[PDB]
Each structure stands twice: as structure tokens, then as C-alpha cells.
Symmetry: C2
């Protein structure tokens, strides 16, 4: 699930659409970094990844970006491919994934209001 | 801050009190693993660490454990020793830091 916390992109056709949504909209960043953390523990908890992927799928629909990101989150043979697609599409530094997961804590502070 | 979400320990005098609270209570895992994530990023955001440490301190009060874990969270020269005290007290292997931080996401589900 993801209730849209931000409006549609003004650059839906841009190769930067998803990367810019990530930067500008904390809620999309939270779901994206949550997904990275879930990926890193996929082999011990596939259901958590599946839920995080569904949440991300929900949040991506908010963006209006044209670029499709099929995570194939229920298909073990395609999990890696789908996650790499996500990284490519969002223009994430793929050598920094550990760090980005660790930032989920900063982006989703507790307690909060 | 931390709004106590679990009951205080049955073994407040024990050297195992904090490790036992961590084992039993998700809320204490949440604040502990959040602290770990904040520590891993200390060198780029000390304020976030200070806040997470204060939150952890508050969660420690909720446990009722007598043992102290002084994180020295405002003192750069002592952050390392404070965090090592945290690891020793909660019986967390330093090799496990990355994994435990990554688990904050699983233990703090969004949306909610
Ligand atoms: Zn929350």
C-alpha cells in the first residue's frame, strides 16, 4: 500500500523522472530505501521483500513516470533482474546500496508525529 | 523520546537484563537497531545519532534495567567507546551491525 503523499511528476517522459521523484519526495524515498533494505535480507525473508515491493509499486504509481519498473517480486528467478531494473531506473549508485539502506532510519525517524 | 511500549524487566539487577529485553521486546529492538543504523552513518550526521541515542536512552529507562549504557552521544571522542559498551551490554556481535541495521526496515513496517 501507498497513499500518494506527493503529486505527479512534471517530467513523466524524462530519463530523470524517477530519480527526481526520489530526491524531491521523502515518501517515495522512504519506500525506495525500505525496498533496498528488504532486498538485502531477501534470502531470509521473501515475504517482507514482496510487501516492500508492493508498497514501492504503489508509490511509483504516484509519480506518473513513464519508465516501467517491474520488480518481479514473487519470482525468485527474476528478483535480481527486477531489482537491478529498479536501481537503473532510479539512477541509484549501485556501489552505495548498503549506505542507502542505513539511511532509511534517518528518513523514517522514530518516534514521530 | 520513547513512549514505553513494553513492560519493565523481571530481572532488573541482572547483567543479562538489557540483552533479555532486546530478545523479548520488538520496541527495544527497534530503538537498538535504529541506533546501529545511526552509528553506521555517524561521520555524516552526528545530530541523527544524538537523537537516536537519546531515544535509546529513553527505551533503556522503559526496561527498568539497572545496568548503565552511557553512549556519550554528544562527545565525539567517546562515541566509539559508548557504542562498544552498547554492543557489550546487549551482547551484539560487531560483525552483525550491517545485518541488524538492515532489519530496522522489517521491524518498523511502513505504511502504518
Ligand atoms: Zn511510523
Amino acid at each position: 500500500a501507498y497513499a500518494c503523499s506527493f503529486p505527479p511528476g512534471e517530467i513523466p517522459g524524462s530519463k530523470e523522472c524517477l530519480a527526481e521523484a526520489l530526491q524531491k519526495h521523502q515518501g517515495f524515498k522512504k519506500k525506495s530505501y525500505a525496498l533496498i533494505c528488504a532486498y538485502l535480507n531477501y534470502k531470509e525473508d521473501a515475504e517482507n521483500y514482496e510487501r516492500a515491493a508492493e508498497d514501492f509499486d504503489s508509490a511509483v504509481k504516484c509519480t506518473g513516470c513513464k519508465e516501467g519498473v517491474d520488480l518481479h517480486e514473487g519470482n525468485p528467478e527474476l528478483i535480481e533482474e527486477g531489482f537491478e531494473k529498479f536501481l537503473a531506473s532510479l539512477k541509484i549508485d549501485r556501489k552505495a546500496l548498503g549506505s542507502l539502506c542505513t539511511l532509511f532510519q534517518k528518513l523514517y525517524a522514530i518516534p514521530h508525529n
